[PDB]
Each structure stands twice: as C-alpha cells, then as structure tokens.
Amino acid sequence: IVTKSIVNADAEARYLSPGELDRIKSFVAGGQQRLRIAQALTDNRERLVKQAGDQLFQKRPDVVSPGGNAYGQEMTATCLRDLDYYLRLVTYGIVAGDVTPIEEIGVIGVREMYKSLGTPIEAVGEGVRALKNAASTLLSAEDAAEAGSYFDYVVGALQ
Amino acid sequence: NDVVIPSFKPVQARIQSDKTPILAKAIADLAAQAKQMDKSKPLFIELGRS
Numbered sequence: 747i748v749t750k751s752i753v754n755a756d757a758e759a760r761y762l763s764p765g766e767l768d769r770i771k772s773f774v775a776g777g778q779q780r781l782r783i784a785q786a787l788t789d790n791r792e793r794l795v796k797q798a799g800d801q802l803f804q805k806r807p808d809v810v811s812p813g814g815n816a817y818g819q820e821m822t823a824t825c826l827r828d829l830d831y832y833l834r835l836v837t838y839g840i841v842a843g844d845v846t847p848i849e850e851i852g853v854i855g856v857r858e859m860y861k862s863l864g865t866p867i868e869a870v871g872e873g874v875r876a877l878k879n880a881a882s883t884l885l886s887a888e889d890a891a892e893a894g895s896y897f898d899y900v901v902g903a904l905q
Numbered sequence: 906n907d908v909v910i911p912s913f914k915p916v917q918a919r920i921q922s923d924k925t926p927i928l929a930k931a932i933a934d935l936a937a938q939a940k941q942m943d944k945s946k947p948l949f950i951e952l953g954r955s
C-alpha cells in the first residue's frame with residue numbers, strides 16, 4: 747500500500763496525506779497477522795492446490811474430457827501448476843496489501859494469453875474460486891474473509 | 906460540658922454504580938459484546954455456541 751499511496755500523491759503535487767499515513771500505520775499494525783496468514787498458506791500449498799483442482803474437475807469435466815485442454819497427465823500437471831502460480835500470487839497480494847503484485851504478474855494480460863492457448867477463462871476462474879473456498883475452510887473466520895477477498899479480486903479479474 | 910464534635914458520622918452516597926451512565930452504558934454494551942459472533946477464531950466453532 748506504500749507504492750500505491752506514493753504514486754497517488756505523485757500524481758498530485760503534494761505530499762502524503764494524514765489519512766494515507768493512517769492507512770500505512772494500520773497496514774503496519776495488521777502486517778504481522780498477514781504474515782501469519784501467509785505462513786499458513788505457504789505450508790498448506792500441496793493439499794489446497796489438489797483439493798481446488800479436483801473440485802474444479804468435479805464442477806467442470808470439460809477440461810479433462812478428451813476434447814478439452816487438460817487431457818492427459820502432463821496437461822493436468824500444468825493445470826495444477828497454474829493453480830499453484832495463482833495461489834502464490836494470492837499470498838503475495840495478502841502480504842503486500844496492494845493488488846499490484848497480483849496484477850502485474852498474473853492479471854494484466856491473461857485474457858489474450860488464454861485465448862491463444864486455447865484454454866477457457868471461466869474454468870481457471872472456477873479453479874481459483876475453489877482455491878478461495880478451500881483456503882476459507884483452512885483459516886480462521888475473519889482471517890478467511892481477508893484471504894478470500896484477495897482471492898475474490900483474482901476471480902473477478904480473470905473473468 | 907457536652908462534647909462538641911464526638912465523631913464523624915459516615916454518610917452513604919445516593920448513587921452507587923447504576924447511574925454514571927456510560928459506566929452503565931458499558932455494563933450493557935459489553936454484556937451484549939459477548940454474544941455477537943466474535944470473529945477471531947474459525948467460523949465453524951462459532952455456529953455451535955448456545
């Protein structure tokens with residue numbers, strides 16, 4: 747939240763506002779809890795990714811259908827690696843407080859990419875929604891609100 | 906000959922704690938703080954509390 751506040755006060759000619767300095771103070775105060783949430787999500791990488799991908803294949807069997815993109819062991823391994831990448835970017839966004847790491851690493855040009863790869867966008871989005879549900883079940887309650895709202899940004903930005 | 910001031914009679918107050926009405930508002934607000942969802946721990950343990 748420091749980069750966004752600095753560039754927002756950079757667009758104007760003035761310094762950082764007292765409101766924005768309160769935002770940075772509150773972000774520092776919540777930063778240790780955010781590191782705890784990142785600790786839990788780092789250590790639960792395997793089973794979260796596998797449960798979310800298998801929930802996706804329960805919801806959407808078109809990708810693992812033989813006409814689909816994720817047909818075969820190697821293709822489905824790359825599917826789970828894509829879900830791993832998005833969970834990693836979600837942890838980065840939970841730590842930073844911005845969504846600029848999520849955005850400029852994995853959001854900004856993903857539609858044209860998955861159009862050229864032949865992969866449907868909505869199934870990626872359903873898999874990240876499954877990640878949101880799984881990480882919501884793992885964490886503490888309003889902590890899961892925090893994690894699932896960054897997950898919610900990723901889900902709404904993919905579609 | 907009679908004693909002028911024998912002692913000091915202790916006098917009781919006419920307000921104990923029921924007034925002072927945000928000590929009293931705090932009794933209420935905090936008594937009702939206990940039974941509102943308290944989101945700090947997982948959510949599944951907090952639907953099963955009577």
Ligand SMILES: CCC1=C(C)/C(=C/C2=NC(=C\c3[nH]c(/C=C4\NC(=O)[C@H](C)[C@H]4CC)c(C)c3CCC(=O)O)/C(CCC(=O)O)=C2C)NC1=O
Pocket residue numbers: 809815816817821822824825826828829831832835851852863865866867868869870871873
């Ligand atoms: C960190 C940001 C980031 C993303 C998102 C990313 C995706 C990505 N997905 C790929 C393939 C793939 N991606 C999928 C994805 C899916 N199967 C489905 O049906 C679902 C909708 C979806 C799972 C979410 C599949 C099936 C392939 C293999 C397609 C192919 O090999 O042609 C490839 C090419 C092979 C590779 O290098 O792994 C990239 C680069 N790369 C990145 O750096």
